[PDB]
């Protein structure tokens, strides 16, 4: 109410020293209601300042000047100017404008984007500003599309400078938090457009078991339900809730073997064309809404019907959960239009996500992108996604920039959905950033070629394939604990670099480098190798410190920009001296939480991690060489310990504390090892090898290696050459 | 031409000549204002390096050693002494790497690798610095020639090129600084040792002259125009040349045909990154790979 | 004017500026006190320590309250008060649409360093006078990024020597001044001959202004105003007539290396013209590829 003030037909909210709301109202009436967008306009009292005069006033805050001189909002009656130099004259908002430095935010789906599509923009800026228009229906208090704001113009101004952290934080708590997700949701899953039985479905679940790949989900796709079946005077069989009987004769009985498996299990639900009289709900949904079954009235999909929403939970998805179905994947394509205005992708996450919590707590959906707030309904799923190097060269940039708009949970097709063409190394790679995405969903087309089943490639591949499926399960407690850390902080899971290091302009130069949690950094490498090193690379920035391969224990002395080189089974991700990261010691167990974590410790500075459980907290301390790990709770729960390279601790219960001073610091990796192994695999001279190997050998000065290798023809092995030099320096 | 007449000047003779062609001649003011003065510039060298060559002269018919030698006649077990095929020594005092190759337009400089021994060596020129034993690219424009001394190295210079004079008058004995070192002048009528032993540089003669010797030690003219045998202590003179990393990199950038959106970002990280390592790693992200090498050998002297 | 700067205290006084929060003086050209204040209490103090005149230097958009370009108000009303100060008085500033040729100079601004704005630049300024702007002062020798190569850099300063205006400037780059000495033996003294030529063609550019000011007349005209229904007129875009008495067909490409020389196609009107420095002959009527070292400029007179 001190935050509130009106002027002219304006009304501004001054909810933090950098978040502005701003209305106009024809009718002198503004909006106390919530939006599709904003669930909360609730904020702590802030101090500012107000110059108001006859005809104009200006709000000021530490971070900003927001000048109204009256009327209708124009670009020259409603402006800001921010209190930052970021810029030399893109400091100032005039509103229906765009200014530079957006770092953008994401956009509804991937559907047939071969590389890179354009993105709507976010509420970070390089120039410390960004408007958030809220442009939604109003809600009833209990969530349902209540009409048209009173507030016919309604604006957010963020003017946080370069505190994204900040700023995503606070627009959380406008548009509501993340949901905690369920454990299950991060775990592998199984996904393909693939005509499937029950038999078949179940054989293909044990041999991934036999195979030592971890499952958390089972995905059925369309195929589940009736579509050649269905005859053409009802259109196609996309839309489908009738299982095919051939395929699935006992569906509650394949869902039961499914659940003894330890999956959950989801269908895909093409909506579009709701219930038509061939289905097998038809019947009852015609009693329920009155339909004309003698003229085959359609049930036509309409979300904003409130009769038509029962209908479809109570009595086309009801029958399909109680033979067993944990989780709907919603799969709208059909585009925006509604009598109301609201868009039924919105209506369908808004509404499902809703009605998901009565089966299942912190239960989830799989929909795509539905605007600002749809972060309230994951998970995310980006959808057909053309199988290319340009399409997975575009995607962690993709991930990371979505934070940017707090829609942290993204699951993309893993190897890419459709059309494009077979490499096994892009398939490899994409399942490499598909681990380290917030989501890791195998999925493919309806191609006889497409499948990701890791047998489906040499053994090479194949191993490699299983090793990261199994790193997947391993990281679940990380990957769980940001979970809860999103849920109850508003922190993404994946952060673009400028959210650590808002001043560094290398942040800003690396689109696909990434923090994976808080102990983790990535740097996926989404070319093809170069086939004379037999190696892909990227160029990696390495912030200030000291940075350690978190496979190999190779190291690096930053602040450096560095292309690294890595063979198609290797990934470059990266922790600095003093992280400590937890791994589940039993990927392939069937168990609610692990019985047993390794703490894997790297050295040469002070750190900690809080590992946050369903039913626990624990801290992993790391100070003056002293590992402490205690609990809020007790349990059988066995500790192991790696600092570096060696198994210090094995199985070991409940709390404790040991000295590490006086153990082995360093890792194994060496220059030598790995000089001899990138010449080996090279498709180079054997004298060129011979040369390098002996010169780099009896040359004793670091400058004169460098000056050695800065000869050498092959540019591109000299940037390997030199990578091995500088972790070796 | 202005390349062929730098080896020329630093080869066993200096004979400008030429074909029938109108086209043809090798006069310096057939070429622009640039290419003249350089060309003047090598041919005044020449006169200069008289008394060297003399010197060297009178060891050939004396004791059989050549004034050209390649490197592989003083470094016989070195594998890089047989793969530097237009380098070679020039007398005991210079190694010289001529370029031989068309400048990079990029650049404005043309390249030549130089196998640099054991020791400390100084561009003759500049004094630009090397560390050896290394091969390293190295880079001048097209008025400037690769030729280097060791720490230690004596080189009289006659210093009235231009006068009509039997034997010189005056005498620069060229110190280059970091070690001992000596010079013998065989001369028609007379011999002078100069010697440079921990810091002190001595000049006799078998017979006296009213010859005026001038003494450049690194950078500085230490004694101008004296007469007779003498000695004079350089320990506490300014040992250290003027080349700088920072002046010649500024130079490299200025000349060079690339974007100024490069040259301002390559001065501004090299500028601004301390460590010697991290300068390196900076420049080995240069998209231009020739840039990157002439990148590397300002850092290399600079290190 | 924000309340760190020098005349704030005297403006925030004028205009009733609540000091203590440190309210700006935001620009507003619309506002009768705020121009007075501009000029009178900003400018004011400048003009007195002797600033001869002012480049108005304005990138930040077409947006006003009263639908006005600002840049139209800074040119209209800074012209009209720099009259005060010096008679016959100029600005400095980018185009503000037709009529504003009334407040020269024209300042074209942050072109990109290349042969290919080079290339645009002739016309571009000869074209100009269709709308009657017939004062473009462009940066010579071209603003900021692009590519070093001191023959674009003489190219530029060549043409710059036969335009409206010739005015050296260049980026916050350490590596792009115009000063001559920057550049080769060669590249400076053929600079510094052409910067003297300048001076010396300073009668022959006062003239042609009094007769802009007096009859209408550009002193850069296209070939079609002297050649109407020549189709030839329409074919040189980078030609120009210079005056009255002087036709320039700059080279704005880059020299064969195999000639050492540049070249641009001219078309020569009907009657005998001369290489304005050399004397060379050229019958016209006809259409003839002509070759310059990058030291020399095809600039043509005809007899009489
Ligand atoms: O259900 C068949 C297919 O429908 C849509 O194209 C979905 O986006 C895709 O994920 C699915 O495999």
Known sequence: NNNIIKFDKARFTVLTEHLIRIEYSETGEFEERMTQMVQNREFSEVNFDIIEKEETIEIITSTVHLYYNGGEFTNASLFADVKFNFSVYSNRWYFGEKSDGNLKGTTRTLDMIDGECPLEDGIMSKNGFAVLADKGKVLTEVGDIAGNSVSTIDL??????????????????????????????????????????????????????????????????????????????????????????????????????????????????????????????????????????????????????????????????????????????????????????????????????????????????????????????????????????????????????????GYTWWSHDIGGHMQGYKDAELSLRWLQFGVFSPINRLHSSKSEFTSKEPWHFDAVIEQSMIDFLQLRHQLIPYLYSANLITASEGRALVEPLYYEYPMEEEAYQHRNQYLFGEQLMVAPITEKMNSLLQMGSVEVWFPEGTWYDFFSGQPYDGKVSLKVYREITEMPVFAKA??????????????????????????????????????????????????????????SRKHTIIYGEHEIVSAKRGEFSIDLNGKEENFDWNFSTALFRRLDIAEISYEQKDEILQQLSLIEEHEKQVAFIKTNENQELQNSLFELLYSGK
């Open 156 to 405: 957010y101004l963020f003017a946080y400078g370069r505190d994204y952290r900040q700023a995503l934080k606070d627009f959380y708590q406008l548009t509501g938090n993340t949901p905690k997700l369920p454990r299950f949701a991060l775990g592998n899953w199984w996904s393909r457009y693939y005509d499937y039985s029950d038999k078949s479905y179940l054989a293909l679940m044990d041999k991934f078991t036999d195979k030592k790949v971890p499952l958390s989900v089972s995905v059925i796709d369309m195929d589940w339900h009736k579509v050649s079946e269905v005859p053409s005077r009802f259109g196609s069989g996309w839309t489908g809730y009738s299982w095919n009987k051939k395929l699935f004769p006992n569906p509650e009985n394949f869902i039961d073997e499914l659940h003894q498996r330890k999956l959950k299990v989801t269908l895909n639900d093409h909506p579009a064309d709701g219930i038509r009289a061939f289905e097998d709900p038809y019947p009852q949904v015609a009693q329920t809404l009155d339909l004309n079954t003698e003229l085959e009235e359609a049930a036509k999909f309409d979300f904003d019907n409130l009769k038509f929403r029962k209908a479809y939970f109570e009595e086309v998805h009801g029958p399909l959960e109680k033979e067993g179905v944990d989780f709907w994947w919603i799969d709208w394509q059909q585009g925006a239009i509604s009598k109301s205005g609201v868009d039924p992708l919105w209506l369908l996450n808004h509404y499902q996500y809703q009605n998901a919590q009565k089966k299942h707590k912190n239960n989830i959906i799989l929909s795509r992108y539905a605007g600002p707030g749809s972060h309230r309904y994951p998970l995310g799923f980006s959808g057909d996604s053309v199988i290319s190097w340009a399409s997975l060269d575009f995607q962690p940039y993709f991930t990371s920039t979505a934070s940017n708009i």
């Open 578 to 635: 003093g992280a400590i990261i937890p791994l589940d010691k039993n990927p392939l167990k069937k168990e609610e939480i692990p019985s047993e974590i390794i703490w894997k410790i790297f050295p040469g500075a002070d750190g900690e991690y809080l590992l946050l459980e369903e039913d626990n907290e624990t801290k992993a301390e790391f100070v003056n060489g002293i590992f402490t790990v205690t609990s809020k709770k007790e349990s």
